[PDB]
């Protein structure tokens, strides 16, 4: 008798219990310890290397483990793989579809991913012996736009797409091994922990859900935001992660705490974030707001360590190397400014 | 060595730069188009009536040696707040509106709120909208027969008359002209509500004749880049 009503009432009671359990272990906040650590200061970073080769707006990028080559996607049908050290476009992949929204550099530098409104996550071989690059595998299992994707190895990658479901793909068989379902809004981004065993994924329903790559289920759910979580990136520690949504406020959640630690709010900004990643130490949170600027926030002092000039359009993608050497920001002006 | 691999890298970068400079002229020539509607509003008929032509994602045509990239989204999900931001460098957001499906749900209002969301978007505010009032031939028998009246879905139609700058069609009753041009003026009300000058709506009626429709897109897109360049030089 009225299974929907009673089951939704039970779900609301469970959500209230989750909130009470979160506030029970929340007797303080991350700000209560800012008096113990010293800030970094207003560090103004300049563009050491600029990458002006794209024909359309740059929507996605990703860094390699070598911290030298970086891939970037734009709506011109081209995928440009630059060498950030000497400023040379190592590769130019002609994409099947112009509008692409995701980028993922393989942990071995041998593969790369794509995807957009075509709903196809075209993998490409980088160090292939055939000379130019070619399509490695056409991952066609998503009913919506491919928002973001990450690489786990040269065999399996994960893709968070706009079909409210993430999928751990497999480059060998070309089929989804597991499918992470549970998001109510179209997913917008995702990130992998340094351990690579579990990954977090931010969607448009303000839910930064944490899934486990081994079991394929939903480990934790972080509904602490207020709008579409356009960007999300796991802390270098592996137990926390920052999330930049459309509400112009970034939120730092923690896995073991299962709640929000800090809110990087500011009255001067009213436009949401679309690109977020952490530095090598995680103290600096690079957040690409929609105001043509990028804010380096002090992830432990709850204040912005510096605003970046440069980009004239919306900065849509951001990437910090695995050693934190330099942060590459790609905006909608077909430019990639590499700050350091 | 010191320059052995760097010279090859620079040669590859030069080849990639040549390829990108060759493709930049193409990207500037192929004016991408966003074809969308409030659902089954006749976009499939627009794709069919375009150069007589992986499901339905992107269709390309070319008129007067000017190619276009009409991207359809008939395979995406319901929510449009994110994948529509990818059409920020797009030339024209061709809004195929069903001018006769206002009865069914109120698909007309569904198109208005989407057009209002496209107009007042933070990224689609610099892109004009080619308003394609599809199913105009269906509208002819929808308002005259009394089966579907704008009054049941819009009260402003009672206080609305045919404008002085209207172009009637031979064999079309003024009640249809008053109804059809109300759909244009209703979308144009949202189009002129912003008044930013960076983008203007281009209301056009289609689906009545099976003639070439890509000319209606070419002649609109020509005026789109015209007013885009006019606004660039402050001549508009």
């Amino acid at each position, epitope marked *: 008798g009225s299974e929907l009503d009673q089951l939704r009432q039970e779900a609301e009671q469970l959500k209230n219990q989750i909130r009470d359990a979160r506030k029970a272990c929340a007797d303080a906040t991350l700000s209560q310890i800012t008096n113990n650590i010293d800030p970094v200061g207003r560090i103004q970073m300049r563009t050491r290397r600029t990458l002006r080769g794209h024909l359309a707006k740059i929507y996605a990028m990703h860094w390699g483990t070598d911290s030298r080559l970086l891939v970037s996607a734009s709506q011109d049908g081209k995928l440009i793989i630059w060498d950030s050290y000497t400023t040379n476009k190592v590769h130019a992949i002609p994409l099947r579809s112009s509008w692409v929204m995701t980028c993922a550099y393989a942990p071995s530098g041998n593969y790369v991913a794509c995807g957009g409104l075509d709903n196809i996550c075209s993998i490409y071989n980088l160090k292939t012996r055939e000379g130019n690059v070619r399509v490695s595998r056409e991952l066609a299992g998503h009913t919506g736009y491919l928002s973001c994707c990450r690489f786990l190895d040269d065999n399996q990658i994960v893709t968070s797409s706009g079909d409210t479901t993430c999928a751990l793909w497999d480059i060998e068989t070309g089929q989804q091994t597991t499918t992470f379902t549970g998001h109510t809004g179209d997913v917008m981004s995702l990130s992998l922990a340094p351990d690579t065993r579990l990954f977090v994924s931010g969607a448009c329903d*303000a839910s930064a859900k944490l899934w486990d790559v081994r079991e394929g289920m939903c480990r934790q759910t972080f*509904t602490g935001h207020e709008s579409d979580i356009n960007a999300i990136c796991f802390f270098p520690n592996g137990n926390a992660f920052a999330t930049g949504s459309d*509400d112009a406020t970034c939120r730092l959640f923690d896995l073991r705490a299962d709640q929000e630690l800090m809110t990087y709010s500011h009255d001067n900004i009213i436009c949401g974030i679309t690109s977020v990643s952490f530095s090598k130490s995680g103290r600096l949170l690079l957040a690409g707001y929609d105001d043509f600027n990028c804010n380096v926030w002090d992830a432990l002092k709850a204040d912005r360590a510096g605003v970046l000039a440069g980009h004239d359009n919306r900065v849509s993608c951001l990437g910090v190397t695995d050693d934190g050497m330099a942060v590459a920001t790609g905006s909608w002006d077909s430019f990639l400014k590499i700050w350091n | 060595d010191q320059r052995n691999e760097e010279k090859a890298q620079r040669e590859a970068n030069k080849k990639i730069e040549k390829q990108l400079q060759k493709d930049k002229q193409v990207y500037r020539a192929t004016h991408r188009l966003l074809l969308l509607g409030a659902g089954e509003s006749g976009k499939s008929t627009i794709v069919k009536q375009m150069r007589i032509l992986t499901g339905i994602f992107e269709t390309k045509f070319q008129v007067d040696k000017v190619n276009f990239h009409m991207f359809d989204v008939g395979a995406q999900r319901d929510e*449009r707040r994110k994948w529509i931001q990818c059409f920020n460098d797009v030339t024209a957001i061709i809004f195929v509106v069903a001018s006769s499906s206002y009865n069914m749900t109120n698909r007309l209002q569904e198109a208005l709120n989407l057009f209002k969301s496209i107009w007042n978007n933070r990224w689609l505010r610099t892109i004009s909208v080619i308003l394609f009032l599809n199913k105009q031939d269906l509208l002819a028998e929808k308002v005259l027969a009394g089966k579907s009246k704008i009054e049941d879905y819009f009260p402003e139609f009672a206080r609305y008359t045919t404008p002085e700058d209207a172009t009637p069609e031979p064999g079309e009753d003024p009640r249809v002209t008053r109804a059809k041009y109300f759909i244009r003026d209703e979308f144009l009300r949202i189009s002129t509500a912003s008044g930013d000058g960076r983008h203007y709506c281009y209301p056009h009626f289609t689906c009545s004749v099976d003639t070439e429709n890509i000319r209606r897109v070419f002649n609109d897109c020509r005026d789109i880049i015209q007013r885009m360049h006019l606004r660039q030089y402050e001549l508009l």
Partner: nanobody
Amino acid sequence: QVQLQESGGGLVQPGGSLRLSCAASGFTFSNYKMNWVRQAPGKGLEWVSDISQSGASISYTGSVKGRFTISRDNAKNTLYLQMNSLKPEDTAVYYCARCPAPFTRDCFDVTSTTYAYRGQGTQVTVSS
């Protein structure tokens, strides 16, 4: 946690009055373009009314234009929908569909179900 509880509604006589109170908790109510979107039984979700971030850009759909009245209250973070002169066609489940992005005027909640910021809804039905 973004949650919207739209209390009110029920089985009322057509042509009377009703008040839907959307308690919207979990976000800054004074920054999102709150709006009401109804779904008729058997039909899709149809946008009903909308209000700006402060209460200036007030708009309703043609089916309820002039009859309904939307009003935001940023002091208590509540959206009120005063339905006047009800219609036999107004029987539907009304959701407190919030605008996706704050400080903007574009809302994409007019689409189909499974929307992000959309409450459980209130089955506002009319009598016969």
